[PDB]
Amino acid sequence: GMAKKTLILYYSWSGETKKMAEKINSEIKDSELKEVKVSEGTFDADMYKTSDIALDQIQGNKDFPEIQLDNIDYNNYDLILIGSPVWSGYPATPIKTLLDQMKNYRGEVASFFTSAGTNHKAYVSHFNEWADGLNVIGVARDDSEVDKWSK
Numbered sequence: 001g002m003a004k005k006t007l008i009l010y011y012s013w014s015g016e017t018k019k020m021a022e023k024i025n026s027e028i029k030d031s032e033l034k035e036v037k038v039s040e041g042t043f044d045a046d047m048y049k050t051s052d053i054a055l056d057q058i059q060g061n062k063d064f065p066e067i068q069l070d071n072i073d074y075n076n077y078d079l080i081l082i083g084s085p086v087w088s089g090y091p092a093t094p095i096k097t098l099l100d101q102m103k104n105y106r107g108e109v110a111s112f113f114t115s116a117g118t119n120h121k122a123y124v125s126h127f128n129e130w131a132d133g134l135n136v137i138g139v140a141r142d143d144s145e146v147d148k149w150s151k
């Protein structure tokens with residue numbers, strides 16, 4: 001059918017997912033790319049401190065983080081690709097806030113993740129939870145399923 005008008009959104013703590021999002025942007029004709037940020041002080045330069053902050057959000061003890069991103073009408077797109085690192089089998093916590101803000105999006109969603117190779121099944125299942133109510137068509141590592149998602 002008609003080419004899917006595609007938005008690529010990503011959160012990146014150490015820059016790897018940003019590079020992947022840029023690569024996917026280059027692969028998908030006319031795609032738009034937008035970064036999701038959090039304020040300085042939300043996490044930490046130290047990965048173990050960052051993990052512990054995310055965990056306390058996951059466990060319900062601290063609120064999920066507020067995010068900063070451009071104003072977007074999500075219903076301008078057919079497909080929204082959401083990029084994140086894998087954080088102990090979950091997407092990064094800013095993604096939960098993002099997905100909540102996308103509540104009224106009627107199109108297709110997929111997530112690409114970057115990782116060091118582990119806890120992928122958990123990422124998939126948790127992403128789908130966090131995206132409940134949205135039409136999730138797939139979750140995959142890197143750009144491995146970009147072609148599939150485009151059809």
Ligand SMILES: Cc1cc2nc3c(=O)[nH]c(=O)nc-3n(C[C@H](O)[C@H](O)[C@H](O)COP(=O)(O)O)c2cc1C
Pocket residue numbers: 011012013014015016017018047050051054084085086087088089114115116117118119
């Ligand atoms: C808090 C934290 C938890 C992580 N947990 C996992 C994990 O469960 N499995 C894995 O393969 N990599 C894990 N990683 C590594 C990241 O998924 C990987 O470095 C990713 O490519 C980083 O993306 P980014 O640079 O966009 O933040 C973790 C990294 C951090 C900081």
